[PDB]
């Protein structure tokens, strides 16, 4: 997958080389285009989960960066759902299995920071994570998909 | 029973709901949600109060959707339903029957959690039905 012209094109929308230069309108329009495109590639493959996670992470990022004040609940609910689904699509296959292992060991295994496991537990069972906890965890998850997927996307 | 809960019931579920504007209705919802947020900071607040606040937050976002990408309203609504169900329930289907929680909520929680994100229409149906449920089983008996 990491070589296809389709994912290489998506990488340039989600992670423009251009980025500091580009206007935020243009930036968001490129993000939005990539999100629409992802709906097009929908497999039960690890890559598909990364693409869909990336789409919703940037959906949450724009909502977080656009927050102008007032009630913060909808943006925290949006970001929290995104993080849960991101973690779950990476961890569910083992955790939902007949031979599940402790999530901390399972996260250590795919190099997923424990903060994401803790975030998921809070958003699932406890107080909804705060605005800044959501912003930090959406930022770090974008870092993660980049480190573990997008960085390696290139034409051969 | 408490004055605060009696006041909140009139903001979430006003009498004049038939004859009131979206703006007026939504300003009262936001007042109620900010009040809950305020109670929750200081003191212990019930799950039904917290979920009612987020449910109306999700409802407003759903009704205000006007086109374009629907992902954020669906993510918002899905997280609200998951927490609503989790606070009530944590064999889920069996537990839900015991408390008269429709099975559709367990199925929604599962999809949002583990599979495809539910559709805009599934989100609206669920939020509507969850607001009906907290009325039937909590708010209706406050007076």
Residue numbers in the entry:
A (entry chain A): 10 to 165
B (entry chain B): 12 to 101, 111 to 163
Q: Anything the authors wrote about it?
A:
A HEPN (higher eukaryote and prokaryote nucleotide binding) nuclease Las1 and a polynucleotide kinase Grc3 assemble into a tetramerase responsible for rRNA maturation. Las1 and Grc3 are highly conserved proteins and have recently been identified as core enzymes involved in processing and removing ITS2 spacer, which is a key step in the synthesis of 60S ribosomal subunit. Recent studies have demonstrated that Las1 is an endoribonuclease that contains a HEPN (higher eukaryote and prokaryote nucleotide binding) domain responsible for rRNA processing. Grc3 is a polynucleotide kinase responsible not only for Las1 nuclease activation, but also for nonspecific phosphorylation of the 5′-OH of the 26S pre-rRNA produced by Las1 cleavage, providing a signal for further processing by Rat1-Rai1 exonuclease.
The crystallographic asymmetric unit contained three Las1 HEPN molecules (HEPN1, HEPN2, and HEPN3), each of which assumes an all α-helical fold. Analysis of crystal packing and interactions across HEPN-HEPN interfaces suggests that the biological unit of Las1 HEPN domain may contain a homodimer and a monomer. HEPN1 and HEPN2 molecules form a face-to-face dimer related through the preudo-twofold axis, similar to the HEPN dimer in the Las1-Grc3 tetramer structure. Secondly, the catalytic residues in HEPN1 and HEPN2 domains are close to each other to form a compact active center, whereas the catalytic residues in HEPN3 and its symmetry-related molecule remain far apart, presenting two separate catalytic sites. We compared the HEPN domain dimer structures in CjLas1 and CjLas1-Grc3 complex by superposition and observed that significant conformational changes occur in HEPN domains upon Grc3 binding. Remarkably, large conformational changes are observed in the catalytic pocket. These observations indicate that the Grc3 binding not only stabilizes the Las1 HEPN dimer, but also promotes the formation of a more compact catalytic pocket, showing better catalytic activity for specific cleavage of ITS2.
